[PDB]
Amino acid sequence: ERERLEEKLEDANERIAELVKLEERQRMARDLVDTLGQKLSLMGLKSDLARKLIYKDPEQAARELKSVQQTARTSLNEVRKIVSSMKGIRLKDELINIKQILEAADIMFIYEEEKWPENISLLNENILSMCLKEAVTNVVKHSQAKTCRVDIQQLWKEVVITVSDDGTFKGEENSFHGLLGMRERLEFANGSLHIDTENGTKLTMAIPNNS
Amino acid sequence: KLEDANERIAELVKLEERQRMARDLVDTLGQKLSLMGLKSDLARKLIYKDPEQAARELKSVQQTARTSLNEVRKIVSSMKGIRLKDELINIKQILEAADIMFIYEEEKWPENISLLNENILSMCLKEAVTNVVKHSQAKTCRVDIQQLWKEVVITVSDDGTFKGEENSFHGLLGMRERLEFANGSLHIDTENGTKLTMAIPNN
Numbered sequence A: 001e002r003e004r005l006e007e008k009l010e011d012a013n014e015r016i017a018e019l020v021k022l023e024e025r026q027r028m029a030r031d032l033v034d035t036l037g038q039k040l041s042l043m044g045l046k047s048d049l050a051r052k053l054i055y056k057d058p059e060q061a062a063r064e065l066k067s068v069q070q071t072a073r074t075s076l077n078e079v080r081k082i083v084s085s086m087k088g089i090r091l092k093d094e095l096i097n098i099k100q101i102l103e104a105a106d107i108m109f110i111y112e113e114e115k116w117p118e119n120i121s122l123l124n125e126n127i128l129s130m131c132l133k134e135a136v137t138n139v140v141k142h143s144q145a146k147t148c149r150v151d152i153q154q155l156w157k158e159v160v161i162t163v164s165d166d167g168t169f170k171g172e173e174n175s176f177h178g179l180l181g182m183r184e185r186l187e188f189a190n191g192s193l194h195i196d197t198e199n200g201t202k203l204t205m206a207i208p209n210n211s
Numbered sequence B: 001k002l003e004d005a006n007e008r009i010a011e012l013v014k015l016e017e018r019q020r021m022a023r024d025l026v027d028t029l030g031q032k033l034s035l036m037g038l039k040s041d042l043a044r045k046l047i048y049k050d051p052e053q054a055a056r057e058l059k060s061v062q063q064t065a066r067t068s069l070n071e072v073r074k075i076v077s078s079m080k081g082i083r084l085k086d087e088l089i090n091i092k093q094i095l096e097a098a099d100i101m102f103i104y105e106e107e108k109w110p111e112n113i114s115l116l117n118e119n120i121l122s123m124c125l126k127e128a129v130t131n132v133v134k135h136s137q138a139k140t141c142r143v144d145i146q147q148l149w150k151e152v153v154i155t156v157s158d159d160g161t162f163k164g165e166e167n168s169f170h171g172l173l174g175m176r177e178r179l180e181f182a183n184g185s186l187h188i189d190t191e192n193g194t195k196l197t198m199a200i201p202n203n
């Protein structure tokens, strides 16, 4: 009887579990709306500057419009991939995943666990995940590293992930395509990428927690 | 443990409609982003060939950006809008209170209309009928809701008298803006009574 009630509690907890998935999808959609909104404003501003510059400075006006096109192109490209499922890669899951890739590659995985980033958007998590996966894939294909260190830090208004390997960088002076892919999606989020290849390869990727 | 479960399920189920409204915003914002992409590109191609036409396209880009953000702004937090079935009932009730005769011949209900576009049409219908009650002195108000080919058309016709000037273009501008946002339209005939036709694409 309570016997049978405890049953209904679990059916209830099971449906709450599925429903929470919808809630994460609702959160991802919201993140899309916020980002599309901001890019829409930015484009607004740049096209307005361009209009004010059509006579004063036509070449600068063409440059602003070219930045408008690029913003549009790359916004649609990042949303396109997400819109049907409204699901991305979680950072906890990717971190596990790259551990497994490193183990199969027999490259030692160094990770010191510290405060996990608390209030990161599903969009920005997906971006950082895809970048971490790309940085580590590269470690495995190209570095000949013996170790690979991942640091994930919640700094002030930003999350910074560092992937450092102690192999050798095999790219040219102008290796700028996984690498451009990373830079684009991070700059789309108002973040950044830095590469040091001086002794091993160090990628630092930074992304605002929100907007 | 049990009581609270279904109280949590009872709300989280509401995400189903909210999740739909959010996809509708993402789709609309996407489209307006593309359209701004295209217009700014045409503007760029015209900087030297036709500067004044370039300026015009960029002004259209600004407008599109402004009004888009204005429509979304109101919906984003709640992700909830008015349903057309519920507004139809509501305007019945306003007309009854106003003692204006509500004429509605029921026909095929629009089947595949976006929540966003429903919310727009609802707010336009509510405005049209509010106006009927405040200004028309009509005895009848007829509302027609028609699924035409790729568009839904709602006609609100009263047999009172139009009290506005020649340039009454602010509920009316509100209507025209939000319908043009959705790629729809508004027409007013005030010849004998006031007739508003509002049209919006389904998706």
Ligand SMILES: Nc1ncnc2c1ncn2[C@@H]1O[C@H](COP(=O)(O)OP(=O)(O)CP(=O)(O)O)[C@@H](O)[C@H]1O
Binding pocket: A135, A138, A139, A142, A143, A165, A167, A168, A169, A170, A171, A172, A175, A177, A178, A179, A180, A201
């Ligand atoms: N961790 C790393 N260690 C050593 N070399 C690396 C590295 N990551 C990248 N590289 C070098 O930089 C080049 C560019 O890498 P990038 O990922 O940009 O394109 P790719 O060369 O892996 C083909 P793709 O990325 O398109 O699969 C690689 O070919 C490799 O030479």
Ligand SMILES: Nc1ncnc2c1ncn2[C@@H]1O[C@H](COP(=O)(O)OP(=O)(O)CP(=O)(O)O)[C@@H](O)[C@H]1O
Binding pocket: B131, B132, B135, B136, B137, B158, B160, B161, B162, B163, B164, B165, B168, B170, B171, B172, B173, B194
């Ligand atoms: N169905 C109708 N019958 C008679 N007059 C109408 C009418 N609809 C609109 N009007 C007239 O047009 C004017 C403009 O309508 P609109 O709704 O744009 O602004 P409003 O005058 O109602 C202030 P608000 O929009 O805040 O109510 C009204 O004041 C009224 O003169």
Ligand SMILES: [Ca+2]
Binding pocket: A134, A137, A138, A177, A178, A179
């Ligand atoms: Ca690569």
Ligand SMILES: [Ca+2]
Binding pocket: B127, B130, B131, B170, B171, B172
């Ligand atoms: Ca009004």
